[PDB]
From Swiss-Prot, chain A:
HEAT repeats lie at residues 1-36, 41-78, 80-115, 123-157, 163-200, 202-239, 240-274, 326-363, 369-412, 416-455, 460-497, 508-547, 551-588, 591-628, 633-670, 674-713, 715-747, 748-784, 791-828, 829-866, 867-899, 900-937, 941-978, 982-1036, 1038-1072, 1079-1128. This is Cullin-associated NEDD8-dissociated protein 1. It comes from Homo sapiens. Interacts with TBP. Part of a complex that contains CUL1 and RBX1. Interacts with unneddylated cullins: interacts with CUL1, CUL2, CUL3, CUL4A, CUL4B and CUL5. Does not bind neddylated CUL1. Interaction with cullins is abolished in presence of COMMD1, which antagonizes with CAND1 for interacting with cullins. Interacts with ERCC6. Interacts with DCUN1D1, DCUN1D2, DCUN1D3, DCUN1D4 and DCUN1D5; these interactions are bridged by cullins and strongly inhibits the neddylation of cullins. GO terms for cellular component: cullin-RING ubiquitin ligase complex; cytoplasm; cytosol; extracellular exosome; extracellular region; ficolin-1-rich granule lumen; Golgi apparatus; membrane. The modification N6-acetyllysine is found at residues 52, 910. Transmembrane segments: none annotated. Key assembly factor of SCF (SKP1-CUL1-F-box protein) E3 ubiquitin ligase complexes that promotes the exchange of the substrate-recognition F-box subunit in SCF complexes, thereby playing a key role in the cellular repertoire of SCF complexes. Acts as a F-box protein exchange factor. The exchange activity of CAND1 is coupled with cycles of neddylation conjugation: in the deneddylated state, cullin-binding CAND1 binds CUL1-RBX1, increasing dissociation of the SCF complex and promoting exchange of the F-box protein. Probably plays a similar role in other cullin-RING E3 ubiquitin ligase complexes. One of its GO terms (molecular function) is TBP-class protein binding. The keyword Phosphoprotein applies. Keywords: Acetylation, Cytoplasm, Nucleus, Phosphoprotein, Repeat, Ubl conjugation pathway.
UniProtKB/Swiss-Prot annotation, chain B:
GO terms for biological process: cellular response to amino acid stimulus; cellular response to oxidative stress; cellular response to UV; DNA damage response; negative regulation of insulin receptor signaling pathway; negative regulation of response to oxidative stress; negative regulation of type I interferon production; positive regulation of canonical NF-kappaB signal transduction. It is found in: Cytoplasm; Nucleus. The lineage of its organism: Eukaryota, Metazoa, Chordata, Craniata, Vertebrata. This is E3 ubiquitin-protein ligase RBX1. Zn(2+) 1 binds at residues 24, 27, 52, 55. It catalyses: S-ubiquitinyl-[E2 ubiquitin-conjugating enzyme]-L-cysteine + [acceptor protein]-L-lysine = [E2 ubiquitin-conjugating enzyme]-L-cysteine + N(6)-ubiquitinyl-[acceptor protein]-L-lysine; S-[NEDD8-protein]-yl-[E2 NEDD8-conjugating enzyme]-L-cysteine + [cullin]-L-lysine = [E2 NEDD8-conjugating enzyme]-L-cysteine + N(6)-[NEDD8-protein]-yl-[cullin]-L-lysine. E3 ubiquitin ligase component of multiple cullin-RING-based E3 ubiquitin-protein ligase (CRLs) complexes which mediate the ubiquitination and subsequent proteasomal degradation of target proteins, including proteins involved in cell cycle progression, signal transduction, transcription and transcription-coupled nucleotide excision repair. CRLs complexes and ARIH1 collaborate in tandem to mediate ubiquitination of target proteins, ARIH1 mediating addition of the first ubiquitin on CRLs targets. Belongs to the RING-box family. Widely expressed. Expressed in oocytes (at protein level). Zn(2+) 2 binds at residues 35, 38, 40, 54. The gene is Rbx1.
Curated annotation (Swiss-Prot), chain C:
Pathway: Protein modification; protein ubiquitination. There is a cross-link at residue 642 (Glycyl lysine isopeptide (Lys-Gly) (interchain with G-Cter in NEDD8)). Belongs to the cullin family. Core component of multiple cullin-RING-based E3 ubiquitin-protein ligase complexes which mediate the ubiquitination and subsequent proteasomal degradation of target proteins. The functional specificity of the E3 ubiquitin-protein ligase complex depends on the variable substrate recognition subunit. CUL4B may act within the complex as a scaffold protein, contributing to catalysis through positioning of the substrate and the ubiquitin-conjugating enzyme. The chain holds residues 211 to 913 of 913 of the full protein. This is Cullin-4B. The keyword Cell cycle applies. It comes from Homo sapiens. Neddylated. Deneddylated via its interaction with the COP9 signalosome (CSN) complex.
Length: 1155, 80, 696
């Protein structure tokens, strides 16, 4: 306001503490809003008034005044803000000391309230005064207070004052030679922020000055501050000190050499922030230049030299993974484990330095790196016997964490070492010396041991282990109690061994282990993490220690029932009860199943999902093992809750519930009077569904197989066929699902004779009956006749074979299935018919062979072996090009026959290969292609020998042989390269050859007036190129990248179809090996020039344009990738190209397109 | 023939305003024996005089200096 | 006969290039046989003629396609060659009938161009409808399906075929929204199977790959309209609809093990979905809130607390530096979440901070790692409700450091004053340096005591302090050897006669001094307490004294005496020896002066008793701050009632809580109100329990 501010400014000096306080405070809330009304007179009075109160006798008015200036600046004049600084900057020089503290603190407050526009003018006035204040004219804390604000400025607004950078530097350099050690350390922090926000020219001025003065050696008191400086720069700048270091590291080695507690300590920690921030420098020097200095204690300031050396090793191990395998494990553990005692702080960093080494040894997700560690185990154990009985809490904690990591990385490695460790655990565990923080680690470690070892190793030690563990369960503090119970949970699995039988005394501890747990379960009045761990544990105690437990069990079970109703513990008690019910020690549950099952059924609608799956899985294993407790009421409670669970939305929830019903069906055939409502109805909500998985499908077939056997009302056999087929007797994708489902019902209850019969006359009556109906009819026959012996009603064969010639090709393709699948059920009968039919008439040759595939692809291996040589003879005869598929269908049976047994057939193919025909040689190599599998298969060792024999004598043949030979190489290099990685030396010479344009194979076959040139050797080249893409994923280990990038060039100017493939080879190359690419980056960009600049003749069509325009943008898409390269990218032609693309509009309208 | 000799000595003494047998300069009862608007703790100021808080709070109403010095009154301690 | 010879001069040229059989006439002669045939009237039955034979050839191609082989990979390479041929034989007819397009059909807007027709016949007779089309879309989708696992396709085959559908406008239609339909059910299965089949780190490995494939498949052969609606299907299936279930089973783990690797990945991915970034923000808060409320709620962790609190804040900074790409939303989530847990424990966390720094400035030299300590301690201090608890505890621990032994560094104290008076106060420091002013006003009156008395003729350095500013000490009489009670009074009657009209009140608890030690194999000196010195001094008159005869000649209360003789004797086995020896001392215990002088260095410090906080004094120094609060409440209400005359109760509780940081639950506040009503400083009325009035 105008008069209210003419009011406050009078209250602001009314000689009362309370007056001045509230006046400022009210003004401080008004300046922190949008601030209504401050005329150009207020600015010259309010700011004149604030500055006064920075000298008040009351300090609280001083506080409000200082905290006022900040939220005043972002709401006032450009000229007025300058005026403030000039006051504070002169107040730095100061008269009274009170002013020197409050003005310096005020200046910090202002420096924060700067966001980029006006903030430059603010800082420029300050920076000009601080530089003159940093000047050497002797002042203890006038130099200091100025240096303090200087750092607080460059961290926030160091981006501004770019033209003031070389002003600051040339005034901070001669302050490192100050009498006060304090100044030197204060200037380092100031320089810390400078090296960051500045650019090269002034960074170099520092580094060189720093180096040349180090070379000057001059003064000892400075040389130590001058090394401290190279340190803090490595922290702040990081990669900036990357370049200037080959010049640096030698001089600092020449100094940690020199006799001095002080300086040597300051060099090792400088050496740290070189291998901690710039993994470029690679030097083993630092390792050895620590090993010597890691033990400098003669017999007090000396200690710190070790600690700094330990830190470095830890930060050298934390980065390098290639230095671990051989190197570290022999040179460091021999010294780390050695120096495992000393003074607590160095010990702690030494310990830590082995943890980092153990961190590094982790699984990747002669001798392996861990076998060396396996050898090192006994020395560590020996060392840790001494350490684990230590007074210090922190030392012993590093011991347990050491083991905890060790046991996780190399499990079982603490087997022959247990008895010399346990006393150490038991000590720290129960004696008063510890903290909560420590025994909780001692427990965790004990747990981690118990899990990853044979329960046998602990047997003779359960004596000293149980007493304190059980005592820990009863600890006051909640975080210990849970971890103690989580140990107790495994202790029971150590007396149990119900995986493998083992005679061990159990009874002496079931008294103590039981009571301590229920005292924590019957509490209901402590932390909920304990409440749950008590249940998770007591589960395992009941599961295992049942036959030795008193009449406490049935009453405690009731406690599990009451913890089940709880909104918090339920899930924990659900799976705690899942494990009890399924224990081989068949323990009672009859007294809590009565009401338990409904309370369990209830959970199903709580949509917790996690609880849904947990309760289902318990319902399964509760209905199984106690199928005599179940009432008709219990069941009807569960069934009327399941309908929402069966739905395509969630396959796994559904398929767990279905397979629960499968369990129900088999164990209480009475109960299923009920599923005729919603349950069944929604079970077809999964069949018709176009996402029914092969897993969840077979989880449902078993359900039907177990449902029509029970003979429940409504759900008969001939009843359920119409619940599946009804839908498809009216008018997407899986009709199959409805067939192999209807099949399972037939083989269940054999009123099959007629059920199969109505299905045949449904294909004969193709009049009126649609493909939607004739299709499902066939596929179902195949699925029924797969297990049943269908050689009955000839309204079969000659009716299936009628659908071989249906208007709908959908029908033909599933008619082929039907024949093939039907034959499996009686192989001796159909197989010499189908073999016979193939030669018989070519009029059905193709579709018949495709039935033969399904006969190979499904027959008993016991019952197909008799006919193996016959099939082979028939397939050999048929490499006729009557069609081309005719061959590729045979060249897939042959293939799948080779899978069936390879010993006799794999070299048999190599036999026909030796000197075949133009089409028989095509058949043998493609057969061996369909032998190549994704995951390793029991055929592949015998393959890894023969693929040499194939490929080597397959690159030399001709025509459409090389095309296949190169595809078979591709597939091998792509699917399982361990067939090819050790054959690439002999093969690559043959490959690169097929990358050059065959001049003989270009032929002129012009149509009419316009002339046309075709390239026969295009697809052998287009296939050879797709190998060089394939070999770039797994096989770059065995490659001459330079000789490779020769051929990348050919196809950079080759056919449009190929240019594409190599443009994507570049983008991968410029990442997977940026080193070799840049060396040849000259003759990689000009072929990309040609592909870009050449404009299409404006008279041509819609496609002709875009087909070349999508081409243009795969060249740029490829230029972009060559740009992100280890920076030396500005080579002759490339720097030219960067101005060329920023000149052209259209050629910029392509770089714009993608990124 | 002495085993112990006094080499250095660092004594410590606290200066305080001595007034009529420590008596509060307002209610003049004592300084640790209640006051007027009570018939309760010592209240030290910036100037360093001993007062009952009740009686010293009274003197912020009419004036703002201290009943012995003349410096504007503040607060430095609540307890003897 | 120029009329009907040309009508089939070209019908033997178009019939020649469709069967690749060369004729005589060329593009220079035929082009000029149609340029002079096409006039501005007869050209109507030329486009009608060209169509007439273009139908008769293309319509004969469909009868070639309907054969035996069903396998897509062969059938697709067939459509391909048919489209590669057709397309590349029309673009020769357009160059023959070049003068037909320039003139006639350029000016007939209703009739499509020579090429447009060429495609118009292909989308009507070869693809159009029936087996060929739907089994091509079936074939295209099958390669796509196989590419989504191990199998390798012909990437170029899919390129031309989808380009063809792009050139026939059938892409928009028969593919895109039936491709997506199939893509959506594929990642639905993966998104559910893989989630319950692997761990978050490994599931995120996969989703990044999967997304890389689609965004890569989008470029190679798919059409460019489908980007936005394809990628946002995968994200809606692998990330959307699973967010909460990921942070359910993964986030508590990924934070503990500190996987800056898999965290960084989780962020990049959770950025791509709308509700993503905010859901991680939600869960990240309630992890910090959780881990911190375990660090500070339990006292069984007081030993460490601050230290582990510092370690945590650093870990939480490192993650929001590198994983969370310095997101300002998160630093603000955490800063706020840190304040929420730090204060869920009343006063102890503020206190264990003060005791941390006190120990980090004690009797370590590397200030490069010491200033960085105070930095990150300050960085934690700003979160405290009740910063007053720290004020006093540090103030009283400053007393220890200032009078009983020296600080680790000379500058480090003045460096810590400087590092304090921001986010702390200007009055919170004027009391902190009111002590420093006493330190240097004393050593200034020391020279005026030292530069007079020596010519007039035990070395003595007194530090005279202002009783108001300093932790009010408890006095205790001490029977000082009559020679220093001389120097006590050669100085007392020097002080009162310079600093005028004051009292002085000597303290025995803060007195310390140095003793020359003479026994065997060592002349070493000892820095000891004013209590240690009297107990040791009386060993110049014979050896051994019972607890009784020491207590007589030294004059200490058993509260401190039992502690001092605990040191020197049985305490780490030092200089004395108890006859009935143990941990503690009793009424009839004797102490001989031990004549074996072990210590190796010179100037030994046995002054440990004077360094440690007694729980007598500790539980009491917290208690004095609680009492200190409800008096600043009085200093506050009076100041606000002074400025604004009237105020509401709900507008007065909202003023004091704004004015001071410390707890002050409104139940405490109503007591202090009526300790001013019933003393007439302010008045209730206007017939409501909600408004007050000043009256001075
Ligand atoms: Zn009084
Ligand atoms: Zn009183
Ligand atoms: Zn006074």
């Amino acid at each position: 306001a105008s008069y209210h501010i003419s009011n406050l400014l009078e209250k602001m000096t009314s000689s009362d503490k309370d007056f001045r306080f509230m006046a400022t405070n009210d003004l401080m809330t008004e300046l922190q809003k949008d601030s209504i009304k401050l005329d150009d007179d207020s600015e010259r009075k309010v700011v004149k008034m604030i500055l006064k109160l920075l000298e008040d006798k009351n300090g609280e008015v001083q506080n409000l005044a200082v905290k006022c200036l900040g939220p005043l600046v972002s709401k006032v004049k450009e000229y007025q803000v300058e005026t403030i600084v000039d006051t504070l900057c002169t107040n730095m020089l100061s008269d009274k000391e009170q002013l020197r503290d409050i003005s310096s603190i005020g200046l910090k407050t202002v420096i924060g309230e700067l966001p980029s526009a006006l903030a430059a003018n603010v800082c420029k006035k300050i920076t000009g005064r601080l530089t003159s204040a940093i000047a050497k004219q002797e002042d203890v804390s006038v130099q200091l207070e100025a240096l303090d604000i200087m750092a607080d400025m460059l961290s926030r607004q160091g981006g501004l004052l770019v033209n003031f950078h070389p002003s600051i530097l040339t005034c901070l350099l001669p302050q490192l030679t100050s009498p006060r050690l304090a100044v030197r350390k204060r200037t380092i922090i100031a320089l810390g922020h400078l090296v960051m926000s500045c650019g090269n020219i002034v960074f170099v001025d520092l580094i060189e000055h720093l180096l040349s003065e180090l070379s000057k050696n001059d003064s000892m008191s400075t040389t130590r501050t001058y090394i401290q400086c190279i340190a803090a720069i490595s922290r702040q700048a990081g990669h900036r000190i990357g370049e200037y270091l080959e010049k640096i590291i030698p001089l600092v080695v020449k100094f940690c050499n020199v006799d001095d507690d002080e300086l040597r300590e300051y060099c090792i920690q400088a050496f740290e922030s070189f291998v901690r921030r710039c993994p470029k420098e690679v030097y083993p020097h630092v390792s050895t230049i620590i090993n010597i200095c890691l033990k400098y204690l003669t017999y007090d300031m000396s200690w710190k030299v070790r600690r700094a050396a330990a830190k470095c090793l830890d930060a050298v191990v934390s980065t390098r993974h290639e230095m671990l395998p051989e190197f570290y494990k022999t040179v460091s553990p021999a010294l780390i484990s050695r120096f495992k005692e000393r003074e607590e702080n160095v010990k702690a960093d030494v310990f830590h330095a082995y943890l980092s080494l153990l961190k590094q040894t982790r699984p990747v997700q002669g001798e392996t790196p861990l076998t060396m560690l396996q050898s090192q185990v006994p020395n560590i154990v020996k060392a840790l016997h001494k350490q684990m009985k230590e007074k210090s809490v922190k030392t012993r904690q590093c011991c347990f964490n050491m083991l905890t990591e060790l046991v996780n990385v190399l499990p079982g490695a603490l087997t022959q070492h247990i008895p010399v460790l346990v006393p150490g655990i038991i000590f720290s565990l129960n004696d008063k010396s510890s903290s909560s923080n420590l025994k909780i680690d001692a427990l965790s470690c004990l747990y981690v041991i118990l899990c990853n070892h044979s329960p046998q190793v602990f047997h003779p030690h359960v004596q000293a282990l149980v007493p304190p563990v059980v005592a820990c369960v009863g600890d006051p503090f909640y975080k210990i109690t849970s971890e103690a119970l989580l140990v107790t949970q495994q202790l029971v699995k150590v007396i149990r061994p119900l995986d493998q039988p083992s005679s061990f005394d159990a009874t002496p501890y079931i008294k103590d282990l039981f009571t301590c747990t229920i005292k924590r379960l019957k509490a209901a009045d402590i932390d909920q993490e304990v409440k749950e761990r008590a249940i998770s544990c007591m589960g395992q105690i009941i599961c295992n220690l049942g036959d030795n437990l008193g009449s406490d069990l049935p009453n405690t079970l009731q406690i599990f029932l009451e913890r089940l109703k709880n909104e918090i513990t339920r899930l924990t008690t659900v799976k705690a009860l899942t494990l009890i019910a399924g224990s081989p020690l068949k323990i009672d549950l009859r007294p809590v199943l009565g009401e338990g099952v409904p309370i369990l059924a209830s959970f199903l609608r709580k949509n917790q999902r996690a609880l849904k799956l947990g309760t289902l899985s318990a319902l399964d294993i509760l209905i199984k093992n106690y199928s005599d407790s179940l009432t008709a009421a219990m069941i009807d409670a569960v069934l009327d809750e399941l309908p929402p669970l069966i739905s395509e939305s969630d396959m796994h929830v559904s398929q767990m519930a279905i397979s629960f019903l499968t369990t129900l069906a088999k164990v209480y055939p009475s109960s299923l009077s009920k599923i005729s409502g919603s349950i069944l109805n929604e079970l077809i909500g999964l069949v018709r569904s176009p996402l029914l998985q092969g897993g969840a499908l077979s989880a449902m077939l078993d359900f039907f197989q177990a449902l029509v056997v029970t003979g429940t009302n409504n759900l008969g056999y001939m009843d359920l066929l119409r619940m599946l087929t009804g839908p498809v007797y009216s008018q997407k994708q899986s009709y199959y699902s409805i067939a192999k489902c209807v099949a399972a019902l037939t083989r269940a209850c054999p009123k099959e004779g007629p059920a199969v019969v109505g299905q045949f006359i449904q294909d004969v009556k193709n009049s009126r009956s649609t493909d939607s109906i004739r299709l499902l009819a066939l596929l179902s026959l195949g699925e029924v006749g797969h297990h049943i012996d269908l050689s009955g009603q000839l309204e079969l064969k000659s009716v299936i074979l009628e659908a071989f010639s249906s208007p709908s090709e959908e029908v033909k393709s599933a008619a082929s299935y039907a024949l093939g699948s039907i034959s499996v059920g009686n192989l001796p009968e159909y197989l010499p018919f189908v073999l016979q039919e193939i030669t018989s008439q070519p009029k059905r040759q193709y579709l018949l062979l495709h039935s033969l595939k399904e006969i190979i692809s499904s027959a008993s291996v016991v019952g197909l072996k008799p006919y193996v040589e016959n099939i082979w003879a028939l397939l050999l005869k048929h490499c006729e090009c009557a069609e081309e598929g005719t061959r590729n269908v045979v060249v897939e049976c042959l293939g799948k026959l080779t899978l069936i047994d390879p010993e006799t057939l794999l070299p048999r193919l190599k036999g026909y290969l030796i000197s075949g025909s133009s089409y028989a040689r095509s058949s043998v190599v493609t057969a061996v292609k369909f032998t190549i599998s994704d995951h390793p298969q029991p055929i592949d060792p015998l393959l890894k020998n023969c693929i040499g024999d194939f490929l080597k004598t397959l690159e030399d043949p001709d025509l459409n042989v090389r095309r296949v030979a190169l595809v078979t190489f591709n597939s091998a290099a792509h699917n399982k390269p361990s067939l090819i990685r050790d054959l690439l030396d002999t093969v690559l010479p043959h490959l690169y050859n097929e990358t050059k344009v065959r001049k003989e194979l270009i032929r002129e076959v012009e149509m009419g007036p316009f002339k046309h040139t075709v390239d026969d050797g295009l697809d052998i080249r287009k296939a050879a190129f797709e190998c060089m893409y394939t070999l770039l994923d797994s096989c770059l280990d065995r490659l001459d990248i330079f000789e490779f990038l020769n051929h990348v060039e050919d196809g950079l100017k080759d056919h449009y179809d190929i240019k594409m493939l190599t443009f994507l080879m570049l983008v991968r190359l410029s990442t997977l090996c940026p080193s070799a690419v840049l060396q040849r980056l000259d003759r990689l960009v000009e072929p990309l020039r040609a592909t870009c600049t050449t404009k299409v003749k404006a008279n041509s069509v819609k496609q002709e344009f875009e087909k070349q325009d999508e081409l243009k943008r795969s060249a740029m898409r490829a230029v972009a990738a060559l740009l992100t390269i280890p920076e030396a990218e500005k080579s002759p032609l490339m720097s030219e190209f960067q101005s060329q693309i920023s000149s052209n509009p259209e050629l910029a309208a392509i770089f714009e397109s993608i990124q | 023939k002495k085993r112990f000799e006094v080499k250095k000595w660092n004594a410590v003494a606290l200066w305080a305003w001595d007034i009529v047998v420590d008596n509060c300069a307002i209610c003049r009862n004592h300084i640790m024996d209640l006051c007027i608007e009570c018939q309760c703790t010592v209240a030290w100021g910036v100037c360093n005089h001993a007062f009952h808080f009740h009686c010293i709070s009274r003197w912020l109403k009419t004036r703002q200096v201290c009943p012995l010095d003349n410096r504007e009154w503040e607060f430095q301690k609540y307890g003897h | 006969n120029y009329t009907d010879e040309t009508w089939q001069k070209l019908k033997e040229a178009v019939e020649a290039i469709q069967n690749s059989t060369s004729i005589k006439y060329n593009l220079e002669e035929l082009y000029q046989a149609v340029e002079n045939l096409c006039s501005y009237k007869i050209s109507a039955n030329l486009y009608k003629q060209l169509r007439q034979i273009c139908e008769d050839h293309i319509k004969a191609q469909i009868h070639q396609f309907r054969e035996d082989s069903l396998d897509s990979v062969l059938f697709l390479k067939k459509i391909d060659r048919c489209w590669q041929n057709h397309c590349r034989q029309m673009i020769m007819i357009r160059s023959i009938f070049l003068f037909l397009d320039r003139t006639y059909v350029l000016q007939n807007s209703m009739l499509p161009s020579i090429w447009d027709m060429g495609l118009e016949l292909f989308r009507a007779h070869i693809i159009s409808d029936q087996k060929v089309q739907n089994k091509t879309i079936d074939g295209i989708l099958l390669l796509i399906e196989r590419e989504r696992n191990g199998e390798a396709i012909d990437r170029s085959l899919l390129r031309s075929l989808l380009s063809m559908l792009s050139d026939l406008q059938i892409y928009q239609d028969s593919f895109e929204q039936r491709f997506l339909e199939e893509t959506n059910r594929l990642y639905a299965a993966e998104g559910q199977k893989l989630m319950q089949e692997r761990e978050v780190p490994e599931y995120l490995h996969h989703v990044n790959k999967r997304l890389e494939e689609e965004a890569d498949r989008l470029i190679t052969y798919l059409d460019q309209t489908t980007q936005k609606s394809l990628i946002a299907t995968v994200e809606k299936q692998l990330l959307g609809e699973h967010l909460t279930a990921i942070l359910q089973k993964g986030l508590n783990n990924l934070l503990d093990e500190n996987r800056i690797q898999d965290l960084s990945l989780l962020y990049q991915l959770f950025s791509r979905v709308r509700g993503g970034v905010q859901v991680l923000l939600q869960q990240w808060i309630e992890y910090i809130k959780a881990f911190g409320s375990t660090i500070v709620i339990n006292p069984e962790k007081d030993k460490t607390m601050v230290q582990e609190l510092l370690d945590f804040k650093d870990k939480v900074d490192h993650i929001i530096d590198i994983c969370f790409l310095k997101n300002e939303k998160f630093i603000n989530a955490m800063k706020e979440a840190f304040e929420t847990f730090i204060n869920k424990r009343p006063n102890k966390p503020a206190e264990l901070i003060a005791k941390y720094v006190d120990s980090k400035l004690r009797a370590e030299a590397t200030d490069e790692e010491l200033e960085k300590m105070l930095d990150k301690i300050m960085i934690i201090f700003r979160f405290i409700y009740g910063k007053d608890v720290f004020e006093a505890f540090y103030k009283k621990d400053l007393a220890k450091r200032l009078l009983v032994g020296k600080s680790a560094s000379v500058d480090a104290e003045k460096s810590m004053l400087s590092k304090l008076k921001h986010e702390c106060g200007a009055a919170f420091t004027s009391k902190l340096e009111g002590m420093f002013k006493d330190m240097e006003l004393s050593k200034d009156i020391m020279i005026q005591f030292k530069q007079y008395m020596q010519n007039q003729n035990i070395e003595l350095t007194v530090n005279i302090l202002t009783m108001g500013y300093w932790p009010t000490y408890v006095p205790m009489e001490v029977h000082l050897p009559p020679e220093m009670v001389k120097l006590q009074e050669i100085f007392k009657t020097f002080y009162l006669g310079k600093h005028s009209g004051r009292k002085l009140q000597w303290q025995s608890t803060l007195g310390h001094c140095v003793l020359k030690a003479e026994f065997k194999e060592g002349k070493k000196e000892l820095q000891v307490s004013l209590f240690q010195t009297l107990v040791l001094l009386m060993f110049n008159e014979g050896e051994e004294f019972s607890l009784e005869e020491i207590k007589q000649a030294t004059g200490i209360e058993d509260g401190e005496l039992r502690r001092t003789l605990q040191s020197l004797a049985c305490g780490k086995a030092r200089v004395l020896a108890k006859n009935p020896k143990g941990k503690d001392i009793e009424d009839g215990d004797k102490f001989i002066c031990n004549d074996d002088f072990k210590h190796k260095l010179f100037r030994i410090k046995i002054n440990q008793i004077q360094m440690k906080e007694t729980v007598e004094e500790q539980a009491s120094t917290t208690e004095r701050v609680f009492q200190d609060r409800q008096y600043q409440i009085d200093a506050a209400i009076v100041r606000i009632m002074k400025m604004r005359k009237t105020l509401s109760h709900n507008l007065l509780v909202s003023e004091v809580y704004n004015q001071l940081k410390f707890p002050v639950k409104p139940a405490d506040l109503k007591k202090r109100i009526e300790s001013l009503i019933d003393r007439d400083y302010m008045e209730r009325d206007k017939e409501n329990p909600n408004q007050y009035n000043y009256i001075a």
